[PDB]
Every structure is written in C-alpha cells, then in structure tokens.
Design a binder for this molecule. Structure first.
Ligand SMILES: [Cl-]
Length: 146
C-alpha cells in the first residue's frame, strides 16, 4: 500500500496529539516480518519555535532535519505536502484539501531556525497533480497568544 515519496500521518507517541506528517524515503521489513519506513518529519507551526509575529499560511508545514523510522502499522492515512511554488496553481487528485499541506521553508529542530527552500528535492511519488479550477487565496496568519 505504501511507496517512497508518499506522505503519511503517523500516530504520535502520546495518543490524541496531532499525527506527524512524514515523507517516506525508505521501506523495508525486519527478520520478524515487521514492515518499517524511514523518512523526514514535516513540522506543523506549533511544533516549531518561532517569532511570535511570524505569519503562517493555512496548512503550512516545515521540512525538518528530524528523520526517524517507524513501523508501517503506525500509519493513520496518506496526505500530500506540496512545494509552495506549486501549491497555489495545482492540487493532488484523490486527496481532500484538509490532507494537503504547503511547504515553503525548512526548520531545524537542532538550531531552532528557518530557511527558505530554493529547490524541492523529495522523492517522486505517484500522486497526480492537476491545475486548480479555483486558485487558492494566499492567506497568512500569526499564532494567537493568551
Ligand atoms: Cl520566526
């Protein structure tokens, strides 16, 4: 069911936290027959430390430097992360908009720093992208602090 280049929701370690968004970079099984994936975590805005004034696109995520392995049994479903240069003009067939995210920047969880992406270099999956019949508004909003 899963292929390299797919993005998946992975069960968090604490139940009921938001699932992690992971791009599958490798798949294998161990001698026990347990199936595993390895990939890059994409962080939601509240998983990063950022200037309180920073504005986020709705559905923004950040390509992180955190990579890990998890059993394929921890997958909750598929999703898609699109590079910002394509997200506004194209959308992925067979995905609900709630499961389509946009990525403009990397975030390092080592240094708590952001950097704009110049070249998108993720593995190519079988997702099929078509031009949007309805362009998405560019809409950026900051976090709310009590
Ligand atoms: Cl920031």
């Amino acid at each position: 069911m899963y292929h390299v280049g797919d993005y998946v929701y992975v069960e968090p370690a604490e139940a009921n936290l938001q699932p992690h968004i992971v791009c599958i970079e490798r798949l294998w099984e161990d001698s026990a027959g347990e199936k595993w994936l390895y990939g890059c975590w994409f962080y939601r805005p509240n998983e990063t430390f950022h200037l309180a004034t920073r504005k986020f696109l709705e559905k923004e995520v950040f390509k992180s430097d955190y990579y890990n392995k998890v059993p394929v049994s921890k997958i909750l479903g598929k999703c898609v992360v699109m590079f910002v240069k394509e997200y506004f003009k194209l959308c992925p067939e067979n995905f609900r908009d709630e499961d389509v995210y946009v990525c403009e920047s990397r975030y390092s969880a080592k240094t708590k720093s952001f950097k704009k992406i110049k070249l998108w270099t993720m593995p190519v999956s079988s997702v099929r992208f078509v031009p949007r019949d309805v362009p998405l508004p560019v809409v950026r909003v900051a976090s709310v602090f009590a």
